Structures are given as C-alpha cells and as structure tokens.
Design a protein around this nucleic acid. Structure first.
Ligand SMILES: [Mg+2]
Ligand SMILES: [Mg+2]
Ligand SMILES: [Mg+2]
Ligand SMILES: [Mg+2]
Ligand SMILES: [Mg+2]
Ligand SMILES: [Mg+2]
Ligand SMILES: [Mg+2]
Ligand SMILES: [Mg+2]
Ligand SMILES: [Mg+2]
Ligand SMILES: [Mg+2]
Ligand SMILES: [Mg+2]
Ligand SMILES: [Mg+2]
Ligand SMILES: [Mg+2]
Ligand SMILES: [Mg+2]
Ligand SMILES: [Mg+2]
Ligand SMILES: [Mg+2]
Ligand SMILES: [Mg+2]
Ligand SMILES: [Mg+2]
Ligand SMILES: [Mg+2]
Ligand SMILES: [Mg+2]
Ligand SMILES: [Mg+2]
Ligand SMILES: [Mg+2]
Ligand SMILES: [Mg+2]
Ligand SMILES: [Mg+2]
Ligand SMILES: [Mg+2]
Ligand SMILES: [Mg+2]
Ligand SMILES: [Mg+2]
Ligand SMILES: [Mg+2]
Ligand SMILES: [Mg+2]
Ligand SMILES: [Mg+2]
Ligand SMILES: [Mg+2]
Ligand SMILES: [Mg+2]
Ligand SMILES: [Mg+2]
Ligand SMILES: [Mg+2]
Ligand SMILES: [Mg+2]
Ligand SMILES: [Mg+2]
Ligand SMILES: [Mg+2]
Ligand SMILES: [Mg+2]
Ligand SMILES: [Mg+2]
Ligand SMILES: [Mg+2]
Ligand SMILES: [Mg+2]
Ligand SMILES: [Mg+2]
Ligand SMILES: [Mg+2]
Ligand SMILES: [Mg+2]
Ligand SMILES: [Mg+2]
Ligand SMILES: [Mg+2]
Ligand SMILES: [Mg+2]
Ligand SMILES: [Mg+2]
Ligand SMILES: [Mg+2]
Ligand SMILES: [Mg+2]
Ligand SMILES: [Mg+2]
Ligand SMILES: [Mg+2]
Ligand SMILES: [Mg+2]
Ligand SMILES: [Mg+2]
Ligand SMILES: [Mg+2]
Ligand SMILES: [Mg+2]
Ligand SMILES: [Mg+2]
Ligand SMILES: [Mg+2]
Ligand SMILES: [Mg+2]
Ligand SMILES: [Mg+2]
Ligand SMILES: [Mg+2]
Ligand SMILES: [Mg+2]
Ligand SMILES: [Mg+2]
Ligand SMILES: [Mg+2]
Lengths: 122, 54, 112, 116, 213
RNA sequence: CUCGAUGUCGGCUCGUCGCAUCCUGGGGCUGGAGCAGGUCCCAAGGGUUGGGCUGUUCGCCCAUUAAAGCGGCACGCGAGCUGGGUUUAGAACGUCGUGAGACAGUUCGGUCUCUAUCCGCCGCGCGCGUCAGAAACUUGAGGAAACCUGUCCCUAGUACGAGAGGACCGGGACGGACGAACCUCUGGUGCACCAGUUGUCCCGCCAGGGGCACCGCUGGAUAGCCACGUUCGGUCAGGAUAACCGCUGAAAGCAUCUAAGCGGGAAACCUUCUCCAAGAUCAGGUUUCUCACCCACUUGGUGGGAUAAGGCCCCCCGCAGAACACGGGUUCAAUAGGUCAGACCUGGAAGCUCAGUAAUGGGUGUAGGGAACUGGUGCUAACCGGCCGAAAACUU
RNA sequence: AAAUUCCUUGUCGGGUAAGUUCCGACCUGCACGAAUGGCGUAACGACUUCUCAACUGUCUCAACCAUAGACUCGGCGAAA
RNA sequence: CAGGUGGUCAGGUAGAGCAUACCAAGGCGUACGAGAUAACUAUGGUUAAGGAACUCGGCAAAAUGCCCCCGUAACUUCGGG
C-alpha cells in the first residue's frame, strides 16, 4: 500500500522512471492507495530529454502493489514492485503503452484505456 | 507524594482492622486410633501418614 | 475431525488433483468480463499450502514480463474450473519463500 | 505437552527444562519425591510421556528418552522395571498428594509418586 | 411481530454463494427451545415470553428452579431468558410448552445477534479507548503508553466524571445489528450467519429478527 | 493575594466549554433568469487533513478536502512527557567602557527531583439494609454512548436561457474518515513445536543425541492475542419547536400570523435504536422452594443451641481473572492431566539395506517428531467434610 | 547580509512538490580589516551546520513474546 | 555497599591475539523466598506495506563489518587523501 513519501516505479514510456506520492485522492485524510487509485506525484528521476522533467507534479493511477489485495472471489493477488501510470485528466495515459502486467481492479475503476494497452491483465 | 496531614484515630483504625488472617477449616481424621484435625486439603496425606501432628 | 465438518461437507469439491509445493500447475480461472465468461490460464509454481479443508489455500507464482506475480486461490473454489498438474518438483522446504528473491533462471526447481 | 501459561519455573525457560529433567530422574530412581506444588503439577504430564516411550520399548523410543534424561542408570530402570510394570494401565501413572506447607517461605508442598 | 430464538456459537467457517463470492459465516446452533412462561400485561405490566434452552442433568437444578418448570410441564433446561415483545397483538402465537426450532427464520432474512463478549482483563488506555501514547524516542522518559493529562488546572480543580481511564474491558452485553442469514439448516438446527458474532466459541447467544432491516 | 518558592514560550498526550458558524441542516431580502453568489436571520449534533521553512505562536507555501472555524479554562495540561527558545557558570564576534565588565545584539556547549495520605476519576470486592430465610426471570425512575460526509448514474441536457452553460424536489449505486464486535480468509507474533547448520564440551567410542553461545544463528510455524484483515453501525417513523411561512380575526365597520383559537416548520430538543441501572432508603414486579425444632433466664419484637430450602470454604479446572469476584465440574463424573484416534504444523526419523573411493543419494515410508482445536477411554486427581443459614404484634 | 547585517525571511542565481536554515554572489560594511593579524589552505576533529545513498518501530500505527519489578501468600520491616 | 586498590603465575580447541565463544586445573551458585499469562515501567527479540512522512535535530535503533584478488576521483605542503 502506498501513502505519502512512497516512491513508485513508472510502468509506461513517458520518460519518468520514479515518482513520489504526495496525496492519495478520494477523500479527506485518506491513508492508503491500492490498485486503481489516482495519486498526485512528483517525478524524482527521469530520462534525459523527454516529455517530462525532474520536478513535475503529475497524476497517476497505481497498477501494481506489493501488498496483497483481496478480491471478492476469495482469491488474492500480489506483485513484486509498486508501479504507476501517469494519466491525463480524462483517465487516459500520457504515454502510448504499458510495461509489465496490471491488475484487474483497474476494470471497475473505469480506466479502460490502460487495460487495452497492457500486455497481460490479471 | 507525601502525606499531607496525619490521619485521625477513626481513619487509621478503619483500615488497620481490615488486615486480618483468614482462618482455614478443619475436619476429623482417625489415625492409629488417635483423632486429630487437619484441613480438608491435607486429608489424603493424613491417611497416608505424611502429616506430622507434633 | 472438527466441530464444523458437517457444514463444510456439502461445499467440498472432489476431483481436485494432488499437488505439492514445488510443482508447476495450470490453473483455469473463470473470468467475467462484462457478460462474456471466458476462461484464463495461470501457469506457475505452487509454493504454499495452508490447510484446513474448506479453508485451504494455495499460492502460485509466475514471471509475466520481468515482474513477479502471485495468485492465492482457495482450494474448493468454484471459480477454478479444473487444476491440471504439469511438472513435479524436488524441494526440501514446504513454503518456498526463497523464490521471491531469485529472478530469472535461478528459480529452477528440479524435475522429479 | 501443554506449555506453561505464565512465568516459567526457575526464571528462564532454559531452566524449566533442567528442573523437569532432574525431577524425572529422581522420580524414576526412588519412586517418591517431595517438592513444591507448582513444580509437581508441571512434572506430571512430563513423566507420563516418558513411560509411554518406555512401554513401547523400541530402540527409537530409547533414543527419544535420552534426549531428556542425561543419566543412563535411570534410563535402564525405566525400560527394564518401570516400563513393563505399567504395561496393563492405559495412562495415569503418577499420584500427587498434598503435604503441609514448609516453614521459612510458606511454600506449599506435594509428593509425586508412581502408582504402585 | 419480532421473532426470537436462543443458540450457541459453534465457530466460524466460510462458504460460497450463488455468484461465486466468499461469505464468512458463523455457525450458531439455534437449538430446540421451549416457551415455559408468557408475560401478560394484566399480570406483569409488559409483554414477553421466556425461552428455555440447553441440556442439563436434572440433579444440577435446585429445588426453587425445578419448580418453575413443573408448573409449565417442562423438563429443566440450563439457560432461560426472555424475549421482549411489544403490546400490540401481544402473545397469541405462543403457548406454554410450544417447541421453537431454527426454521422460523428464512433465507435472506436479517437478524440482530447478541451475546456476552470476550474478557480482555484489566486493560490499559491504548487498548480500551484507542489512545495514541507519547513517543518511543526523542527523550520520552517512561511515558510510552501512559495517558498524559487528565484535566485542566485550578479551574476546575477536579477530574470530570466519565473520563476515559484504565480498567476492565470485555464481558459486556453486545448486540451487533443487521446480519444476513445465509442458509438455515433444518436437519442440524444450524443457522449460517454472515460475519462476526459476539462471544466465545460455545457461549449463549440470543438471535432476534431485526427492526432496522 | 503569594518572596520561610504560586516553575515560563512552542510541541506531545488527553480533554472539556461557549457561539461572535468554516462544512453540513433550515429560511428572509436581492442590482436572485438558470449555475454559482452577496448579505442578514435561526441552529453547537457531529465534523474540521498530511507536509516544506523556522525554537517558534504568528506567518508565507505545496498538494488535497464537504470544510481546513474564532475563542475561555494559571495565554487548560512539566508530582504526565519534551527542553529546541528564554534566564546561571565556559567560549567567541561586532559595539560601548582607560578598566573590572556590559548589550530586550548575535553564536556554540550546557543534571528537568518526588514510594499518592485526603478530595476527584476509571475499575473491582467485603459488610449491612431492602420486616422471614433463599433461589430464577424481570419492569425502567434516572443516566451513558452514538449523531460526520462525498463522488457518480437515473429523473433530464427537461425547467431557465439569444448563446455559453445548466437545475431544485424525489429514486438508486459505490466510497473516504470514525467506532464496536470478531479470527473464517490475508498478514504479524511464537522461550517445553519440527527441520537445516557453525564453533565448543560432554554422553567410552563410531553412529545417534544433548548443554551453552541474544530463543546461538537461519527456514517455517497450528492455538492464543491481534491489524494491515473480515463483518456490521450511525436508519426509518412520530411529538414539541427556533428563524421563517400562513388560516380564521377583533380592539380600529378597512386592514393586520394574534389579543381568543388552529396549522406548517431544521443535523439542535424529547421519543424510537445500543448499553448501565431498584443503595430508585418510595430500596419495585411475576413466580417457585423451605414452610421446622430445642434449651435457659429478669417471660423480653430477649439471649444460646440445633436444622430445612439454599449458599460458602476445600478440591479438579477455564478463552473468567492483579487479590477477590464470575463460569464449568466433583464417581449418577468426560473437569483437567494421561491414553487412543483424527485435525494441523514440519518435511521424509532412527535402524537395516543397496549405489558411490568419499562427501552424499535412493528404498523400506505422506516417514518420524509434536502443544493449545475435535471425539472416544473410568487409568491418576476431583476425597470417608467442615463453616454458615428461617418470621413479636397491632390499627381500618 | 559573515561565529560580525539592527532594518531582514534584503535582492539575484542553485537545490526541494513547498527552503526564515544551506551553497554562490551583489555592496546599500546599523557596527569587517592586516601579529587582540587580513585572506587562503592538503591533512586531522566524540566540534558546529547543510544535502544525498544505504538502512531501519523514530513515524503513519501499532501488535505480540520472554525476563526484572508491579500484583498474591510467608518472614523482616523503614522514610520524607 | 554493583564503586576503588600496585606487582607475579596464567592450560586446552577454534582464533592474528592476553579479543570472543565453549572447556581443564581449581573455585563458586553471593545470604529473603514461593507463586502468578493484569495495567504500566525497565531490559532484550520480531514485525506485513511504506521508508525520516518522527523530531529543535536521523536522538535512539537499524545498517556496514573478516581474509585473498582486481580497482580507486577532485585536490595536495608529493607524505598523503
Ligand atoms: Mg499442510
Ligand atoms: Mg505462551
Ligand atoms: Mg519471582
Ligand atoms: Mg539458551
Ligand atoms: Mg485473558
Ligand atoms: Mg506510538
Ligand atoms: Mg528517570
Ligand atoms: Mg524509554
Ligand atoms: Mg526570602
Ligand atoms: Mg510554605
Ligand atoms: Mg507549556
Ligand atoms: Mg447565531
Ligand atoms: Mg440565502
Ligand atoms: Mg464542536
Ligand atoms: Mg439528537
Ligand atoms: Mg480549544
Ligand atoms: Mg499555559
Ligand atoms: Mg493554548
Ligand atoms: Mg500540573
Ligand atoms: Mg501540582
Ligand atoms: Mg561568561
Ligand atoms: Mg576600546
Ligand atoms: Mg543522563
Ligand atoms: Mg506515580
Ligand atoms: Mg428512561
Ligand atoms: Mg442518583
Ligand atoms: Mg477493538
Ligand atoms: Mg483457526
Ligand atoms: Mg497467517
Ligand atoms: Mg525439542
Ligand atoms: Mg558423531
Ligand atoms: Mg556445560
Ligand atoms: Mg493464526
Ligand atoms: Mg423531525
Ligand atoms: Mg438489564
Ligand atoms: Mg427485590
Ligand atoms: Mg464455584
Ligand atoms: Mg531416505
Ligand atoms: Mg559401500
Ligand atoms: Mg497426538
Ligand atoms: Mg551561516
Ligand atoms: Mg537571506
Ligand atoms: Mg553566503
Ligand atoms: Mg571601524
Ligand atoms: Mg599595523
Ligand atoms: Mg593589531
Ligand atoms: Mg587566527
Ligand atoms: Mg508481605
Ligand atoms: Mg564491594
Ligand atoms: Mg588501576
Ligand atoms: Mg587462551
Ligand atoms: Mg574473555
Ligand atoms: Mg553481597
Ligand atoms: Mg508481564
Ligand atoms: Mg516494518
Ligand atoms: Mg519487509
Ligand atoms: Mg529505500
Ligand atoms: Mg534522507
Ligand atoms: Mg506523532
Ligand atoms: Mg511534523
Ligand atoms: Mg520534518
Ligand atoms: Mg547514533
Ligand atoms: Mg547495533
Ligand atoms: Mg575530503
């Protein structure tokens, strides 16, 4: 689970390689950010000469979480790194495709463009 | 903290009287034709002779 | 026996194969994408059993695109269509948590 | 057996294995031990689980008693006398009898003895 | 108007419903009861009904309590509690000696389940009331779990009544409202109730039909 | 008022109160089309975030939110914590002084004592009272706790409007913060559990084990306890009202919510929901059980003795627990321990045998070892027993 | 703009999502200055101060385990 | 009375060692005890996800750690670093 000051790997080709959570949107004094949650972030590392720079304030949906996530069927799911995709203000990604697998909880949070670009959707 | 004032006689005799001994109860034992009194928790060892009646 | 084995007895599923930690297993999961009812295959390595009858779970583990992913299903779950055993394994532990910190070709469980 | 709910005997839990090993050695050697009463409720499931290894009498059960008793002169009398004597008794091999509490600390005392 | 039964918490297990979700249930042996007494407004001032439950040997029940079942024609049970009804068409559906079993609840109904919670002993302030405690470092001399302040200063020179302090937690009468009855099992006398239910495994539990719904 | 001592700024923890109201709730007026507002009136039930900089309060700033309210209580709270700032001794810089030194100038370093007698407060008992002695179930006089809110969809791109934009009123779905119960799942812990392993000493030695090294370290780990986990809650409807809106209607032939009278009216108030409660001294109610002796005196609503129904101590224990209390059990017994068999954890024991020069590997074998959870079994201990404990009458 | 700068969080550049502290500068030096030394400097510091990597119960937000006390029983038995 | 007191002798196995671990010779269990899963305090251990968001301040804790071989920057008073 992701709160403020967590650093996340970035799972798309926007040039950003590592962001840093600031808020967890979705209410007042919200503490944790599961799969399918918008995050205000700050880009702490970036490839030289890209679309984004170091020091930008962007938004991002979380697609991978190390902490286990209960699903309604009784199953669980657990990734091995924390990953986010930078989004536009219409729930569309800034880049053009997604590296690594993404979770199925993006499907009820109406993020349909990120699932269709993903290699594998679990 | 320290005591502010000395207690009266009626206040220090009320607490001190509640420091007392709870007496146990005694039952009857016949050993070797002799009668004694032990508590019931020691009734088996009296019949096994493991109680020195002094 | 337990006190609650007369409740779990109708909810048990027969015809589930006998696997162990260290095996490699295909798991066929029913997935509802809208109103479609397709069937998705999860091929991975069984690392865990936490028993108990109706409450027993297992944990499989694969490596999708350079990212390790685990799924923890219940046994006797009707969202699993059928489990099919692929390859046995030769391990000494029973929980296999050392696979979490080994990447790539160093996670090769022996064959027999 | 059932682990000790509470602070262990003699302080540390390393000391509880030593006290229960030296009381079972002395119980099997003599047949009657006068000790304190909480050290005798603890002894009773620990010595009845060393006669059950002695009643089976195999080599593997002898190698298991020697994990706890460091005295070979009492492992012998456990497999040659105490073992075959209880062969027709399904458990319950010891008896705790409460004695007068001792002077000096009012520590309550009991005797633990084998049944016959 | 308000149905009720007496049972025993047998434990928790899980079960799978019709849309393949997981439902954590709690097995409550809502056993065979017997009525044994009816409270009427012209005799008692209110309206209710007793309920006897649980097998007991007839020598463990003393002579005053044995006589209360003899005027009802019932063999003595262990527990006995009342079901408070309201005084509108009060107690026509109950008779002395009537058997009540577990199938008076239907599937999909909601129940309010009450019992005696588990004893937590003499519990401090960070467990009984959720205090935060002071810090664990930066110089905090021996106050890692202590409350701190409990009042003001010379106005008021007293601690207010109702201040939250340490003491014994648990052993309380707790009602949890609006629990879904998943499956009634008439062969075993077993309700399967979704979710947590107060008490230890084996304790007395009263099950009543809900009003908030 | 305190100098034979009333310890200062901010933070921490825990609060409680007012309303001069930041959000939510109800309304009047509008230079109010709609959407959003401006201002005033009523309203204190709950809510009111995490960071950067500074010793800081103040203040600016970042990112959010339905909102990031203003104040009292020794500018609440150091016998609850902190000691960064300030107000000791060290040292230096600038300025002032011939100098010792000084500076509401700056800078670095600089002991935070106390076993709770009384009142208060959270808990828990013993005693007597409740007109006999006891047991079971209760009514509720009066109190306690709780009270928050968003986004999206439908009604409808309809009402309104030249456009841009965009509803009130009803209905539904999914959340955030908070709280309580709970251990089926996830996850944490695990000091009599299983396994691997290093050094060393002992068991005569090989083999197999053990003591100590933070539980030696490492990998797991059922019960219990738990949150990071599961589940549920704040609801519906009535009564009386605030601002405000009226009906009928005089004094005052009209008019006017008002002087007689009757309605509408909000998260505030009282009920309804959960909980404590007859020490509620007016000490309550419905029931059942015992429903009986004996002796002496000054013949007293008097003292002693022995019982009944019933209870306590002792004993075997508990998921009940600081002591005490509460709950189960006491041979007509499954209470605890053993024992037997499952469940579960661990992961293939020793012995023999085969393969290898050896380290080691395979077979006998889902092996062996093992605790809490379930069920059978009368083997050990629940015993050959003590202490309490029942009634004047009378008036209508 | 300093161990010296009252006005003061001076202004400008760099660093962080946000920098009263920090680094580089300006000179408008309240009140720097050449042995009460001026400005530098490799090495060295349980010094003062600022940032970063790694790391973690310091923290969000706490939970469990053992021990010595606290609590019970027996003995002795103080003090402000 | 947990404090202070100069000099001599000083074995084994592992080890660079008079460190440290376990032992020999030889000493000792050091003088209130028995219990008991309360809160709280002390002294140690472990902790999911996050990793200085704590705080005046990374205080405390955690981490790094040994031998052999490669490799090693600005700067320097040519030693160094
Ligand atoms: Mg298993
Ligand atoms: Mg334990
Ligand atoms: Mg002790
Ligand atoms: Mg040890
Ligand atoms: Mg407890
Ligand atoms: Mg804390
Ligand atoms: Mg101190
Ligand atoms: Mg401390
Ligand atoms: Mg003076
Ligand atoms: Mg004075
Ligand atoms: Mg202060
Ligand atoms: Mg007002
Ligand atoms: Mg208005
Ligand atoms: Mg308020
Ligand atoms: Mg209210
Ligand atoms: Mg205030
Ligand atoms: Mg103050
Ligand atoms: Mg204040
Ligand atoms: Mg004070
Ligand atoms: Mg004071
Ligand atoms: Mg000075
Ligand atoms: Mg001068
Ligand atoms: Mg100190
Ligand atoms: Mg104190
Ligand atoms: Mg009332
Ligand atoms: Mg009162
Ligand atoms: Mg709780
Ligand atoms: Mg369980
Ligand atoms: Mg688990
Ligand atoms: Mg062992
Ligand atoms: Mg050997
Ligand atoms: Mg030794
Ligand atoms: Mg568990
Ligand atoms: Mg209303
Ligand atoms: Mg009640
Ligand atoms: Mg009464
Ligand atoms: Mg009892
Ligand atoms: Mg083998
Ligand atoms: Mg050979
Ligand atoms: Mg067994
Ligand atoms: Mg400076
Ligand atoms: Mg400046
Ligand atoms: Mg500068
Ligand atoms: Mg000058
Ligand atoms: Mg000169
Ligand atoms: Mg000069
Ligand atoms: Mg100089
Ligand atoms: Mg004493
Ligand atoms: Mg000395
Ligand atoms: Mg010296
Ligand atoms: Mg040596
Ligand atoms: Mg040494
Ligand atoms: Mg001494
Ligand atoms: Mg303790
Ligand atoms: Mg952690
Ligand atoms: Mg971790
Ligand atoms: Mg990190
Ligand atoms: Mg850092
Ligand atoms: Mg804090
Ligand atoms: Mg802070
Ligand atoms: Mg900070
Ligand atoms: Mg340090
Ligand atoms: Mg360390
Ligand atoms: Mg350097």
């Amino acid at each position: 689970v992701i709160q403020q000051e967590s650093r996340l790997k970035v799972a798309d080709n926007t040039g950003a390689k590592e962001i840093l959570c600031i808020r967890v949107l979705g209410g007042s004094s919200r503490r944790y950010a599961g799969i399918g949650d918008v995050i205000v972030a700050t880009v702490k590392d970036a490839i030289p000469g890209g679309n984004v720079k170091r020091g930008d304030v962007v938004k991002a949906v979380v697609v991978r979480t190390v902490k286990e996530r209960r699903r309604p069927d009784g199953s669980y799911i657990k990734f091995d790194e924390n990953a986010a995709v930078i989004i536009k203000p219409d729930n569309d990604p800034r880049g053009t495709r997604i590296f690594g697998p993404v979770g199925r909880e993006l499907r009820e949070k109406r993020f349909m463009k990120i699932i269709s670009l993903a290699p594998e959707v679990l | 903290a320290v005591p502010k004032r000395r207690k009266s006689r009626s206040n220090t005799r009320s607490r001190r009287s509640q420091w007392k001994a709870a007496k146990t109860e005694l039952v009857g034992v016949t050993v070797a034709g002799h009668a004694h009194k032990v508590p019931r928790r020691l009734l088996k060892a009296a019949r096994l002779g493991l109680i020195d009646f002094d | 026996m337990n006190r609650l084995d007369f409740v779990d007895k109708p909810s048990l599923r027969d015809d589930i194969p006998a696997f162990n930690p260290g095996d490699t297993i295909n798991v066929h999961v029913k997935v509802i994408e809208g109103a479609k009812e397709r069937l998705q295959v999860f091929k991975g390595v069984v690392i865990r059993r936490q028993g108990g009858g109706i409450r027993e779970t297992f944990t499989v583990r694969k490596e999708s695109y350079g990212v390790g992913v685990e799924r923890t299903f219940p046994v006797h779950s009707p969202n699993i269509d059928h489990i099919e055993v692929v390859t046995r394994g030769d391990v000494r532990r029973a929980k296999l948590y050392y696979l979490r910190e080994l990447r790539g070709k160093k996670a090769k469980i022996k064959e027999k | 057996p059932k682990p000790t709910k509470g602070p262990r005997l003699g302080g540390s839990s390393s000391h509880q294995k030593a006290i229960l090993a030296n009381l079972a050695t002395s119980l099997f050697e003599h047949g009657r031990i006068t000790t304190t009463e909480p050290k005798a409720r603890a002894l009773r499931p620990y010595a009845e689980k060393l006669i059950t290894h002695a009643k089976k009498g195999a080599l593997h059960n002898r190698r298991e008693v020697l994990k706890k008793l460091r005295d070979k002169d009492v492992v012998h009398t456990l497999f040659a006398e105490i073992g075959p004597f209880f062969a027709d008794r399904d458990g319950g091999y010891t008896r705790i009898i409460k004695i007068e509490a001792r002077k000096g600390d009012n520590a309550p005392m009991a005797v633990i003895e084998l049944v016959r | 108007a308000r149905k009720g039964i007496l049972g025993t918490k047998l434990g928790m297990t899980q079960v799978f419903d019709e849309s393949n979700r997981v439902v954590p249930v709690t097995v409550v042996k809502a056993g065979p009861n017997v009525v044994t007494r009816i409270r009427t407004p012209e005799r008692d001032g209110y309206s209710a009904v007793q309920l006897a439950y649980g097998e007991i040997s007839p020598r463990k029940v003393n002579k005053p309590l044995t006589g209360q079942y003899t005027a009802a024609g019932v063999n003595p049970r262990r527990y006995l509690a009342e079901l408070r009804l309201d005084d509108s068409d009060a107690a026509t559906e109950y008779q002395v000696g009537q058997e009540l079993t577990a199938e008076i609840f239907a599937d999909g109904s909601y129940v309010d389940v009450t019992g005696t919670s588990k004893g937590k002993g003499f519990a401090g302030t960070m467990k009984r009331h959720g205090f935060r405690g002071q810090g664990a470092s930066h110089g905090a001399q021996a106050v890692h779990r202590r409350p701190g302040s409990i009042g003001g200063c010379a106005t008021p020179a007293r601690v207010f009544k109702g201040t939250r302090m340490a003491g014994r937690m648990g052993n309380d009468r707790v009602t949890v409202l609006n629990l879904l009855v998943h499956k009634v099992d008439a062969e075993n006398g077993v309700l399967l109730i979704k979710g947590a239910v107060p008490g230890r495994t084996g304790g007395l539990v009263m099950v009543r039909s809900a009003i908030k719904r």
